[PDB]
Ligand binder design. Structure first.
Ligand SMILES: Cc1cc2nc3c(=O)[nH]c(=O)nc-3n(C[C@H](O)[C@H](O)[C@H](O)COP(=O)(O)OP(=O)(O)OC[C@H]3O[C@@H](n4cnc5c(N)ncnc54)[C@H](O)[C@@H]3O)c2cc1C
Ligand SMILES: Cc1cc2nc3c(=O)[nH]c(=O)nc-3n(C[C@H](O)[C@H](O)[C@H](O)COP(=O)(O)OP(=O)(O)OC[C@H]3O[C@@H](n4cnc5c(N)ncnc54)[C@H](O)[C@@H]3O)c2cc1C
Lengths: 340, 342
């Protein structure tokens, strides 16, 4: 049985590994290949802030909260392992800062040690009047992608740098199942007017003194359009823009300024931080993750397509629950072909 | 008047700056000098792990508790300032790990967000069954010493290479007041058998992924003779020996192995960490800090000495309270000569 995963971002590769690890031992034969037109370090994943944290507001689909939880438990469970850091993973603690009282987030018990900030803590941050403290996990996009491609490759899964033009051509090339993990460009293969770019720009900086995440919110401007600081494994990510609808892949001058001045004010030690790079990427914004089976019909036979895209600004955060769910749906497909 | 501070470790330079800041505007002249035979990076201070945290048990002198507290609030008050990191100062969070239930430390409300660990947190650290979480402050010895010498120099305080042989020497050189901040070597200038070396060996390592401090305790083997991991501003300190009475300044292989393997066991990601140096230093261990005024007579001059030494394995943690207290006692020396403050 031939499976082509399209996409080598976090979603693509996580899914490929989950399918393979789940079915290799039982389905003979099983051929899994990954096709993508960019690999690390050239994916949106590579440019992610690298923090586990859902949006502040509850999810529409209740399945999404479960997926986020299963992802946290999965990642956390690696912590005492020798390889957690080679995977891109380490524990970090930090602050969410608000100008007024807000409700507790749905994820308060998923993270470790959630509590509200005290007045002394708040004086660390003069511009803000309310917030949270918790411990979470760094998951570095770049490093995680290199870990997964290594695990996948060791297991015989083969990668092809190529651009896919249609589902039809891949089916015709002999795929029995296609997993569509094309991120924000999924519309090219099948129009989807709910799918939009979430344009985020970031500044990467050497400031290794900073050991905590610091996330501000502006209620009247929408999520991640206010200053955020996230220490990564070797560098710090500085953020504060997230505009849906903008397809500009180039770094913008006002966003640079929004980010630098917002963050220099949040964290004035940044004055001595060396700029390492500045980047722009597109989160696959969609009111709901598209994670569903579709049957396609070209010549003899159906080829089965399973979509997994539209994870917005939380793909690192949610990725493993989604991979598990795709692997289940793939189980159902096998069953319907009496492959077990 | 003429003040000679002996010592350029954290205690020496803290105290010098605190005196100068408090009394610059009320005395004329005020001639403050620092004499030391080692300066950064060659003091014990430079080799400290760089964390704010007192001993787990209450101190003999309860004054020490306020001194630690004042130090925290002082340091904390710099967070949100543009220069906090140039001073060696940044917030950090972390874990204290125990093999059995222990009482809360007296300093639990001084730190930020003290709580007990939950079972999932405890799963991160297999060999341990109980402990704490809190946020505290890194104060890097090396950087803080550099910041202070800069601040002190800007203010007209003068530094001299000088191995002092007696208090008499310095009095007769014309010091009116001597502040004795000589750390573990204070016994040289005035015997003090309550003062002993606390030999600590450490390994410095590049492992910038580590964001939290991690301190284990072994109630039976005494304090800091259990693995400890403390991220610094750009490298990580790996520890686990603290042996009183040992004057051996050279690194030994047995403590190396105790530290490496203990810490690899605590934090197995350390397998990929690059070793970047290994050091030994001597905490000035004393049942309590010696912080007191003494009058010495040489010819018919009275000289005032104020001691500030014996801060053991917590000099960074306590230093500012002790400097403030020395400044107090200096006020009283002034007052006794009909000189006026505020
Ligand atoms: C600035 C920024 C910061 C972020 N920070 C975080 C964070 O801190 N935490 C978090 O959880 N999430 C974060 N996100 C969201 C996260 O980055 C995305 O949800 C995630 O990277 C999307 O993963 P993906 O694999 O779906 O898409 P991508 O990583 O973009 O992967 C898409 C893949 O599909 C391939 N592809 C597409 N079409 C074709 C085709 N036709 N032929 C061949 N190959 C194709 C591409 O080459 C690529 O391999 C952030 C996003 C941005 C922009
Ligand atoms: C391995 C290790 C880790 C530690 N970690 C921590 C920690 O994480 N947190 C913490 O709070 N504390 C820690 N400590 C304790 C801390 O290092 C000490 O309490 C502190 O550095 C002592 O400061 P000091 O200025 O008294 O002495 P020092 O730093 O030793 O300075 C002594 C000064 O006196 C000078 N001097 C002495 N005699 C003479 C003389 N005759 N003439 C001229 N000059 C003289 C020396 O040259 C030097 O300038 C640690 C100690 C060790 C050994």
């Amino acid at each position: 049985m031939r499976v082509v995963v399209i996409g080598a971002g976090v979603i693509g590769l996580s899914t490929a590994l989950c399918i393979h690890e789940r079915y290799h031992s039982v389905l003979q034969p099983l051929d899994v290949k990954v096709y993508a037109d960019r690999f690390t370090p050239f994916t949106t994943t590579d440019v992610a802030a690298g923090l586990w944290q859902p949006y502040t507001s509850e999810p529409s689909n209740p399945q999404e909260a479960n997926w986020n939880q299963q992802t946290f438990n999965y990642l956390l469970s690696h912590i005492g392992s020798p390889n957690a850091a080679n995977m891109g993973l380490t524990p970090v603690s930090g602050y969410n800062l608000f100008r007024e009282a807000v409700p507790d987030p749905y994820w308060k018990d998923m993270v470790l040690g959630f509590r509200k900030l005290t007045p002394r803590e708040l004086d660390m941050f003069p511009d803000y009047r309310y917030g949270w403290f918790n411990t979470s996990l760094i998951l570095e996009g770049r490093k995680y992608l290199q870990w997964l491609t290594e695990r996948l490759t060791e297991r015989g899964v083969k990668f092809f740098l190529r651009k896919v033009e249609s589902f039809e051509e891949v089916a015709r090339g002999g795929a029995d199942v296609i997993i569509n993990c094309t991120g924000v460009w999924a519309g090219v293969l099948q129009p989807d007017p709910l799918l939009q770019p979430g344009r985020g720009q970031i500044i990467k900086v050497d400031a290794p003194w900073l050991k905590n995440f610091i996330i501000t919110h502006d209620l009247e401007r929408g999520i991640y359009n206010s200053p955020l600081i996230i220490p990564g494994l070797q560098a710090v990510t500085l953020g504060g823009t997230f505009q849906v609808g903008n397809w500009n892949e180039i770094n913008n001058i006002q966003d640079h300024n929004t980010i630098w001045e917002g963050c220099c004010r949040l964290e004035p030690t940044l004055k001595d931080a060396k700029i390492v790079g500045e980047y722009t990427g597109f989160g696959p914004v969609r009111p709901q993750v598209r994670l569903e089976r579709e049957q396609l019909r070209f010549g003899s036979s159906n080829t089965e397509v399973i979509h997994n895209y539209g994870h917005g600004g939380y793909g690192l955060t949610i990725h493993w629950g989604c991979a598990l769910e795709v692997a289940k749906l793939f189980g159902k497909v096998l069953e319907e072909r009496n492959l077990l």
